Design an enzyme around this catalytic site. Structure first.
Site, PDB file in Angstrom:
ATOM      1  N   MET B  31     -13.474   6.013  11.912  1.00 16.79           N
ATOM      2  CA  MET B  31     -14.672   6.586  11.339  1.00 16.79           C
ATOM      3  C   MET B  31     -14.479   6.906   9.871  1.00 16.79           C
ATOM      4  SD  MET B  31     -16.503   8.881  14.237  1.00 16.79           S
ATOM      5  CE  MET B  31     -18.095   8.150  14.346  1.00 16.79           C
ATOM      6  N   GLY B  32     -13.475   6.293   9.262  1.00 14.18           N
ATOM      7  CA  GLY B  32     -13.223   6.523   7.849  1.00 14.18           C
ATOM      8  C   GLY B  32     -12.373   7.749   7.609  1.00 14.18           C
ATOM      9  N   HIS B  35      -5.909   8.392   7.329  1.00 14.66           N
ATOM     10  CA  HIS B  35      -4.619   8.987   7.024  1.00 14.66           C
ATOM     11  C   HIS B  35      -3.537   8.088   7.602  1.00 14.66           C
ATOM     12  CE1 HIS B  35      -6.163  10.615  10.859  1.00 14.66           C
ATOM     13  NE2 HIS B  35      -4.943  10.332  11.281  1.00 14.66           N
ATOM     14  N   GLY B  37      -1.891   8.329  10.254  1.00 12.90           N
ATOM     15  CA  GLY B  37      -2.004   8.089  11.681  1.00 12.90           C
ATOM     16  C   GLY B  37      -2.589   6.700  11.874  1.00 12.90           C
ATOM     17  N   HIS B  38      -3.689   6.442  11.169  1.00  7.99           N
ATOM     18  CA  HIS B  38      -4.377   5.159  11.216  1.00  7.99           C
ATOM     19  C   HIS B  38      -3.514   4.012  10.724  1.00  7.99           C
ATOM     20  CE1 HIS B  38      -7.934   7.970  10.881  1.00  7.99           C
ATOM     21  NE2 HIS B  38      -8.148   7.320  12.009  1.00  7.99           N
ATOM     22  N   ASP B 146      -5.270  11.278  21.985  1.00 11.20           N
ATOM     23  CA  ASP B 146      -6.443  11.579  22.811  1.00 11.20           C
ATOM     24  C   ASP B 146      -6.365  10.680  24.039  1.00 11.20           C
ATOM     25  OD1 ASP B 146      -8.940  12.167  24.018  1.00 11.20           O
ATOM     26  OD2 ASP B 146     -10.029  12.163  22.094  1.00 11.20           O
ATOM     27  N   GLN B 149      -9.716   9.769  25.945  1.00 15.72           N
ATOM     28  CA  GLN B 149     -10.452   8.692  25.307  1.00 15.72           C
ATOM     29  C   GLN B 149      -9.814   7.348  25.637  1.00 15.72           C
ATOM     30  OE1 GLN B 149      -9.989   7.571  21.012  1.00 15.72           O
ATOM     31  NE2 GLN B 149     -12.088   8.395  20.826  1.00 15.72           N
ATOM     32  N   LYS B 180       2.767  15.701  14.395  1.00 14.31           N
ATOM     33  CA  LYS B 180       2.074  15.907  13.129  1.00 14.31           C
ATOM     34  C   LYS B 180       0.698  16.490  13.397  1.00 14.31           C
ATOM     35  CE  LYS B 180       3.838  13.202   9.271  1.00 14.31           C
ATOM     36  NZ  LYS B 180       4.882  12.294   9.834  1.00 14.31           N
ATOM     37  N   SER B 182      -2.639  19.164  11.481  1.00  9.94           N
ATOM     38  CA  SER B 182      -3.150  19.941  10.359  1.00  9.94           C
ATOM     39  C   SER B 182      -2.846  21.422  10.551  1.00  9.94           C
ATOM     40  CB  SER B 182      -4.659  19.754  10.223  1.00  9.94           C
ATOM     41  OG  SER B 182      -5.327  20.332  11.332  1.00  9.94           O
TER      42      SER B 182
END
Lengths: 279, 278
Positions: B31-32, B35, B37-38, B146, B149, B180, B182
């Site tokens: 979804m833009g 970071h 992770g992606h 997740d 999901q 990791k 936030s």
């Protein structure tokens, strides 16, 4: 020389490895017990596609169940004679391993015309058609235009799910004089028989109106109801006009329309219909 | 050197033509606001597939908006890793008008979450389903973080018979093993040295299972007992579920999904994993 594939795994494997080489695919989904209305579909596919696949699967989700006729033997031969390359014939257990964790239901279109007459009937159709499109991966998929409600629902699903499949609707096979082939035609007395070729005409002459202007529901309709009662005695059970693919009734039309006739003869009531336009 | 495709029609055409010539496709749905992770998923895909497509699409169907939008920055972020295309469709392109068909998640949407945010995953499967038909990937990458999901997506790929193999990418961890997050910067020097034990208790559960253990209740105690002796804070959860079914089974029969939650001074951390293979 037509192959009979009995597993999903194998079918995907074949199709996957077939596309990795620019060979196109035509697809005719069916439930078996095939007749000429079907071959008309397989022929069109075979003439404009590299390989044609016909699926024969009695889908349990649109129905006790194991009573339905099954002649994969004959279906394969009928189809083989017209060019078809493969007959995908999976077992219920292969298509529906266990309980479905995701559900697909059709909205508005499921109520249009006869909605509560079989709620959930189309839910079962899109569910399988959707799986078949992901298993077979066709370029073109052919559906009969007779069940316009089904064709619209299917086209709606190809759009909502973004399937890269072109949906081709084939016209119902007719009799030499224009009469719609039907199992119930046989209950027509000689006089009634010809007195019925008028349905096949109160229709192709109703598109003449649309063709050059006429675009009002009450006018295009009435123009027919008069034509029929004029050429027959039997009561006109129904003559409706709906928008298409919306299938709703509206005082005046925008795009294509759907006309449904219903003449109740002696021992059998015939029906017929068509959709005309392009948008 | 990454290309930006802004329309469904064009994205479909491009992929359809590449599939015909045998090139393998890797797909990362996002979804833009990307970071590392992606990029971990993108890197994986780039090393194993001919072309890698990353979609950046803010899906209105999983919102009950003013969401961050930085395409030029996401484009560059993924270019540095070798992505081939970023699919960036407009909302009205993806959802022309009103959906005439509706996709819903059954049971898998009730367990844990779902019953707390009804229809969230309905929006997820809907967009993923369309994306798979648009991007036509051989492999699609999702984070294991997740798990609900992931289970749902796998379920959808099975039920719709998508010829896509789902690849779950492992949670990216700090050098010491802490997951990791936030929330990590809210841990005091001290509780930071305790936090590392959540991932450690997981290696424990995996060790037990690894050695034939198969009674959910024992792995729970063993894990719980470990955490209580190493972390002074309070363990507000140590659940064990089967996977994919994601239900609290009394004794393992296949693979499991463990999830922890520890409430620290000013932040609650969570970790989880999946052991097995069937």
């Amino acid at each position: 020389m037509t192959k009979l594939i009995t597993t999903v795994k194998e079918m995907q494997h074949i199709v996957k490895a077939a596309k990795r080489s620019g060979t196109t695919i035509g697809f005719i989904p069916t439930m078996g017990a095939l007749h000429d209305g079907h071959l008309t579909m397989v022929r069109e596919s075979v003439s404009t596609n590299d390989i044609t696949i016909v699926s024969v699967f009695v889908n349990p989700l649109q129905f006790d169940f194991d009573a339905y006729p099954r002649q994969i033997d004959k279906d394969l031969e009928l189809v083989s004679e017209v060019g078809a390359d493969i007959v995908f014939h999976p077992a219920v257990e292969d298509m529906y391993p266990g309980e479905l964790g995701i559900d697909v239901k059709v909205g508005p279109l499921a109520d249009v015309l006869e909605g509560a007459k079989r709620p959930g009937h189309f839910d079962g159709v899109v569910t399988v058609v959707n799986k078949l499109f992901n298993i077979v991966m066709p370029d073109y998929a052919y559906f009969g235009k007779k069940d316009a409600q089904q064709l619209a629902i299917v086209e709606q699903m190809v759009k909502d799910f973004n399937h890269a499949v072109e949906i081709i609707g084939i016209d119902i096979v007719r009799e030499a004089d224009g009469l719609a082939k039907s199992s119930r035609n046989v209950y027509l007395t000689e006089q009634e028989r010809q007195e019925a070729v008028h349905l096949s005409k109160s229709l192709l002459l109703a598109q003449a109106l649309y063709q050059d202007g006429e675009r009002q529901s009450k006018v295009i309709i009435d123009r027919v109801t008069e034509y029929l009662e004029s050429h027959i005695s039997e009561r006109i059970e129904e003559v409706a006009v709906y928008s298409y693919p919306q299938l709703v009734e509206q005082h005046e039309i925008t795009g294509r329309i759907f006309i449904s006739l219903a003449v109740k003869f002696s021992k059998a009531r015939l029906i017929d219909n068509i959709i005309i336009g392009a948008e």
